[PDB]
Design a protein around this nucleic acid. Structure first.
Ligand code: MG
Ligand code: MG
Ligand code: MG
Ligand code: MG
Ligand code: MG
Ligand code: MG
Ligand code: MG
Ligand code: MG
Ligand code: MG
Ligand code: MG
Ligand code: MG
Ligand code: MG
Ligand code: MG
Ligand code: MG
Ligand code: MG
Ligand code: MG
Ligand code: MG
Ligand code: MG
Ligand code: MG
Ligand code: MG
Ligand code: MG
Ligand code: MG
Ligand code: MG
Ligand code: MG
Ligand code: MG
Ligand code: MG
Ligand code: MG
Ligand code: MG
Ligand code: MG
Ligand code: MG
Ligand code: MG
Ligand code: MG
Ligand code: MG
Ligand code: MG
Ligand code: MG
Ligand code: MG
Ligand code: MG
Ligand code: MG
Ligand code: MG
Ligand code: MG
Ligand code: MG
Lengths: 240, 98, 244, 75, 95, 122
RNA sequence: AACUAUUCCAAAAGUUAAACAACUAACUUAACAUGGACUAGCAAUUUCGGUUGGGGUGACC
RNA sequence: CUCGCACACGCUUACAUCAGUAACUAAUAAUAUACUGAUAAUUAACAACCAAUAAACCAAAACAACACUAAAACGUUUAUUAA
RNA sequence: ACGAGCUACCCAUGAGCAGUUUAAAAGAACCAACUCAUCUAUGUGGCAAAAUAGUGAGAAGACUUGUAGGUAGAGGUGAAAA
RNA sequence: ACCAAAGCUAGCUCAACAUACUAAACAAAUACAAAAAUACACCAAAAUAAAAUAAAACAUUCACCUAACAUUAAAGUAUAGGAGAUAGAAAUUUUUAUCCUGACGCUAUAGAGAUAGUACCGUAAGGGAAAGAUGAAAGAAUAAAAUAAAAGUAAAAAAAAGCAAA
């Protein structure tokens, strides 16, 4: 039949909101993605992925926020931090050493002198040093962060040419962006998430992961070790 | 526009009776695609002076892209029609005068 | 047992009874006659008689239209009397190959067209054939007045036509409010198509819309019996007054 | 009003009193007074069925008359 | 063979007969020899002649062909210039 | 295999199924969840004083029936509006515009009990 | 075949020079999207000749 | 000798009283919760039915002191109108 | 066309898990309810179109279970037994 | 002597005609979980029929096959077809009113499934029964009247030896 998506809530809240998992089924009810279902019950914390977000449109200037607490999240691999300034709170993705009772700057301002980079700092790409480590990377300015959000991942700013930044994604592919785009400076939280050991099949089931099929498929030509020259560089810069 | 033709001959009904169709009369062979023809030209009469093409009160032949999407919307030309033609006959007679 | 009248005629004799009887005659006569639509997809041979190539004999020859499907979204635009061809095909065109279902779809374009009499730009899906027919009939409004119902095939074309036909029979001043010059100028070239008013509002109508319209012109709250009885009484009383 | 329902029957639909006008009414809006095209077939069947019944009622009555006429030939 | 057609309810003819045979009016059928256009270089002139003949079919074949063929084909034909009009009656047959 | 034929009733379903037997609703649900009765929706019986009057549930047998004439809109027009209309046309005071003096009502929406949309039960 | 992706020609929207030498072409392509091809995926339809000291193997026709 | 009393779901009068049972139901009888007839009957406090729109709230349930990891069901108050 | 009130897997929403042993609610241990169905004997038109008696395995978990919803046959679903 | 047996009705079948073609019945309730008077919406939609089968297989093909144009001929002709199976026209021709409607149709295993789309069976779409016989009167049941003829039994078990008879 037809199911409605749980993903409707209009107003932003720091309060955890209730959500409905659907194991792999599309809105028609058929299975689209195999091997998903029945984890622990989860609430969802809304994350603001636009790091530069002036509270009121009245005062545009670069603003500063306090880090209140850093909490576990069920929904993503990184650990997240509750961040308050002015009258407003939001959840942002926490950088590696970010701790409670902290100060974090959010700025859109570039300058000729660059900046000494702290961790929680969000700056436009053009404003950073050329060797910096960045996460939560916008593609088009004003879009909001997409790239490099996973736990303990970091990209690196490679160079700056022609009022444009070229950065290196965690997959070691290069990405060309305007230098007007915001990024957070550092490695994302929870670096040991890699080395976690799931002890028992039950533990996997707790993560909402149903077992693989039992069917035996012979390996095809797709299988083997393919060594491909690294792909060409993605450019989100729109030429006139 | 695809132009299509029947593989199987249809029998006759001559009195004005409608032809009696079988399923095998639904099998078509494709004789032409009109879109693949070498395309014709459009004949127009300019009501102003276009840069390259010509003067006000002139009879010009262009490709239908330029005529449909530039000239005719902007009132820079009108169609070659007889009733629109005699207007510029008169205009040509009263121009060369003074 | 048997139906007394053939079922093929049940549609027709449906129209001879009930409200359909009270419809304007010119409208019913526009629905009655189905004129053969202009050949679009199949290409007609001109001659009635054709000499059989194998036989060397004079043969009678007829033209049989190829069934074309019109998706309902074709009724929102103007496709130039064309549509989907639903059919079959041999692969390689060898009669001995597989026989395969095949459907040929018209190439559609988003184009905005200017109507003079209606003074408006419509954003319409049209075919290249429509544009060629507009080109050939020398104007948009021309193409819409100058073409029969069967050849446009669109309910939208018919509504456009109903509209500018009304605007011509009315000589509607609201066309160009400020300039009677432009107005007489435009109403001039189209003077060939001008039709009376009673005809002009019934042109593009579906049988449904027509029946509705006629039901609304016929709408009356039944007259109180007090009125009718009062008039019978006045008749009798005036005939009692005039006899003495 | 005289209406035609889903099943294609021609029904007399009594009206009902509502605080809100008809186009603002959810529940009433989800009734359908009109038939779809397939229904047309069933309609025909109805007629034919009806016709049959009448047809062989008639024939019965006719028959009953003949029988009596040879039982009581007082004519 | 179709003994009762669908539209007309009559009996159809098998056209595959009408292309290779010829019915005289006497009831004799006439046919070409088989393989007479095939591989001529490889054959004797005598054999070639035996092949170029028009020959008559035995009774069984004849009855079979008659069944496979409607009434129209058994009618008496007068053609102008016809080669075979000479042969359609039978003569001096004592049986 | 359940029961198809037997009619659907509140006695049949789960707890959640409550379907009245067809009495009419006397009110609405209020704030506290408690139910509120509207004095206007509860039918008020209009009962005359029977005591001082003489008529009985049955009639004497030798009492006659009568020729049966169903009342028609016409007879009712003749017993009421016809004397007054003839009286005021004979006097020349008849006014085809306003018939309201004879008891004709142009529209029903003013008065308490309307005849056509039928405002009253009984 | 359809369908799902690929690649291409055409269709459709455009854009440039007034092109070059001496005494018309070329290129462009956002999402849809048509006609005709290409390469795969996913598939559709159909079939397992006979003889045989049972069948099969071998042999044969 | 020990699957008892209630509720939900589901069944629908198979329940009650009086009478009858030659035969019909009980896999036999005796007689009767089950066959027959007539006559009655379950009474709301329990249960169903039983408001929307803004706004502050990051802080598990586990005797909850405080924590663990898989990060967790369950509402207050303030305002605006609520026959 | 009709079927997911059985069953497969999901989604919501509820409900159960006593005693003993352990620093421990550790897909630990003993053992009920509960869930399964090892081995044997009965039974084989049977009490039963898969049961009975014994005996067994798990028993805070990838656990059992109620209610309401979903996926449909060229399909679905599948810790693959077609 | 039991079990039984016999009725001739209920209605049906096929055509004719015919007006014209969704019967009857609607007080309330009926598209909430149909039959539940009463609250701010949504509403709606289309895509070629396929295959079994014939071709002694099967691959192009395979009449009829839920689209009004009948009738007499042209004609199973012209044509179309793995030119096989089969399929198959037309030009051109012909057609005189209305009444005389009924039956070399059935009679309860028949004729409709029909006493009824009911019982019952299916979760559902769906499937789908069987059954009648007194007489002018039973407001003539110490009741009166004409078959007592199927198998099955009883009246009446059996007595060496055998396809049971000749
Ligand atoms: Mg997750
Ligand atoms: Mg995490
Ligand atoms: Mg794996
Ligand atoms: Mg495996
Ligand atoms: Mg049932
Ligand atoms: Mg209930
Ligand atoms: Mg209950
Ligand atoms: Mg109360
Ligand atoms: Mg296969
Ligand atoms: Mg096939
Ligand atoms: Mg073999
Ligand atoms: Mg063999
Ligand atoms: Mg052998
Ligand atoms: Mg042997
Ligand atoms: Mg071999
Ligand atoms: Mg029961
Ligand atoms: Mg009782
Ligand atoms: Mg008993
Ligand atoms: Mg279920
Ligand atoms: Mg325990
Ligand atoms: Mg354990
Ligand atoms: Mg056991
Ligand atoms: Mg033992
Ligand atoms: Mg046990
Ligand atoms: Mg154990
Ligand atoms: Mg163990
Ligand atoms: Mg369900
Ligand atoms: Mg298959
Ligand atoms: Mg499958
Ligand atoms: Mg296996
Ligand atoms: Mg075959
Ligand atoms: Mg056979
Ligand atoms: Mg076969
Ligand atoms: Mg077929
Ligand atoms: Mg050929
Ligand atoms: Mg063959
Ligand atoms: Mg003819
Ligand atoms: Mg019967
Ligand atoms: Mg029967
Ligand atoms: Mg006997
Ligand atoms: Mg003997």
């Amino acid at each position: 039949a037809t199911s409605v998506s749980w993903k409707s809530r209009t107003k932003y809240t720091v309060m955890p909101v209730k959500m409905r998992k659907s194991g792999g089924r599309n809105h028609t009810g058929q299975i689209q993605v195999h091997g998903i279902g029945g984890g622990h019950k989860q609430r969802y914390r809304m994350i603001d992925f636009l790091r530069f977000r002036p509270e009121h449109e009245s005062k545009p200037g670069p603003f500063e926020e306090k880090v209140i607490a850093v909490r576990y999240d069920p929904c993503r691999s990184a650990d997240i931090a509750l961040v308050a300034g002015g009258n407003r709170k939001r959840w942002i993705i926490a950088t590696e050493n970010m701790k409670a009772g902290d100060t974090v700057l959010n700025s859109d301002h570039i300058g000729r002198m660059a900046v000494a980079a702290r961790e929680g700092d969000a700056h436009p790409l053009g404003a950073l040093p050329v060797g910096t480590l960045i996460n939560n990377v916008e593609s088009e300015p004003g879009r909001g962060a997409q790239y490099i959000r996973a736990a303990g991942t970091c990209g690196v700013l490679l160079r700056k040419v022609n009022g444009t930044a070229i950065i290196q994604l965690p997959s070691k592919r290069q990405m060309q962006v305007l230098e007007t785009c915001i990024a957070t400076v550092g490695r994302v939280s929870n670096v040991d998430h890699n080395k976690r050991v799931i002890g028992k099949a039950g533990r996997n089931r707790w993560l909402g992961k149903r077992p693989n099929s039992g069917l035996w498929q012979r390996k095809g030509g797709w299988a083997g070790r393919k060594i491909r020259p690294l792909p060409p560089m993605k450019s989100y810069v729109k030429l006139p | 526009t695809v132009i299509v033709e029947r593989w199987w001959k249809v029998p006759l009904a001559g009195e004005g009776r409608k032809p009696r169709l079988h399923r095998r009369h639904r099998v078509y062979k494709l004789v032409e695609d009109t879109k693949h023809r070498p395309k014709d030209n459009l004949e127009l009469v300019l009501t102003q002076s276009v840069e390259e093409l010509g003067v006000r009160g002139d009879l010009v032949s262009v490709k239908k892209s330029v005529g449909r999407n530039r000239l005719l919307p902007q009132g820079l030309a009108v169609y070659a029609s007889p009733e629109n033609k005699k207007l510029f006959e008169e205009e040509k007679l009263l121009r060369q005068e003074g | 047992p048997l139906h007394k009248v053939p079922v093929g005629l049940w549609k027709q004799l449906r129209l001879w009874e009930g409200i359909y009887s009270r419809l304007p005659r010119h409208y019913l006569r526009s629905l009655e006659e189905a004129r053969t639509p202009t050949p679009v997809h199949y290409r007609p041979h001109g001659a009635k008689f054709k000499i059989n190539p194998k036989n060397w004999q004079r043969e009678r020859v007829e033209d049989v239209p190829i069934p074309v499907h019109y998706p309902p979204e074709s009724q929102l635009g103007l496709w130039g009397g064309e549509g989907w061809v639903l059919g079959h095909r041999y692969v390689n065109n060898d009669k001995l190959s597989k026989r395969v279902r095949k459907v040929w779809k018209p190439q559609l374009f988003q184009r905005e067209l200017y109507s003079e009499i209606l003074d408006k730009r419509f954003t319409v899906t049209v075919t290249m054939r429509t544009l060629d027919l507009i080109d050939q009939a020398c104007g948009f409004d021309f193409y819409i007045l100058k073409t029969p119902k069967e050849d446009l095939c669109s309910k939208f074309g018919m509504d456009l036509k109903r509209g500018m036909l009304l605007r011509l029979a009315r000589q509607d001043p609201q066309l160009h409010p400020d300039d009677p010059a432009r107005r007489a100028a435009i109403y001039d070239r189209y003077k060939a198509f001008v039709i009376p008013e009673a005809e002009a509002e019934w042109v593009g109508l579906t049988l449904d819309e027509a029946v509705e319209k006629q039901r609304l012109l016929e709408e009356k709250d039944p007259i109180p019996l007090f009125k009718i009885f009062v008039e019978e009484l006045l008749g009798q009383l005036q005939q009692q007054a005039l006899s003495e | 009003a005289w209406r035609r329902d889903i099943f294609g029957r021609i029904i007399w639909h009594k009206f009902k009193q509502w605080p809100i006008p008809w186009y603002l009414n959810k529940k009433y809006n989800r009734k359908r007074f009109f038939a779809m095209p397939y229904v047309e077939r069933f309609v025909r069947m109805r007629i034919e069925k009806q016709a049959r019944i009448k047809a062989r009622k008639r024939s019965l009555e006719r028959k009953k008359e003949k029988f009596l006429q040879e039982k009581f030939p007082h004519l | 063979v179709t003994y009762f057609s669908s539209r007309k309810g009559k009996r159809k003819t098998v056209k595959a007969v009408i292309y290779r045979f010829l019915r005289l009016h006497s009831g004799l059928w006439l046919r070409r020899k088989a393989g007479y256009k095939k591989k001529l270089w490889k054959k004797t002139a005598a054999r070639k002649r035996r092949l170029r003949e028009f020959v008559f079919c035995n009774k069984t074949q004849s009855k079979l062909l008659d069944k496979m063929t409607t009434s129209f084909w058994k009618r008496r034909n007068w053609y102008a210039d016809d080669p075979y009009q000479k042969y359609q009656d039978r003569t001096n047959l004592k049986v | 295999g359940a029961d198809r034929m037997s009619k659907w009733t509140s006695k049949r379903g789960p707890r959640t199924f409550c379907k009245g037997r067809g009495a009419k609703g006397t009110g609405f649900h209020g704030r506290d969840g408690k139910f509120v009765q509207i004095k206007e929706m509860i039918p008020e019986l209009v009962v005359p004083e029977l005591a001082g009057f003489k008529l009985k549930p049955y009639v004497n047998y030798r009492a006659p029936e009568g020729t049966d004439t169903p009342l028609t809109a016409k007879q009712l027009f003749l017993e009421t509006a016809a004397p007054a209309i003839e009286k005021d046309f004979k006097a020349g005071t008849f006014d085809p515009e306003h018939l309201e003096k004879y008891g004709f009502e142009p529209t029903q929406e003013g008065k308490l009990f309307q005849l056509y949309p039928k405002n009253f039960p009984r």
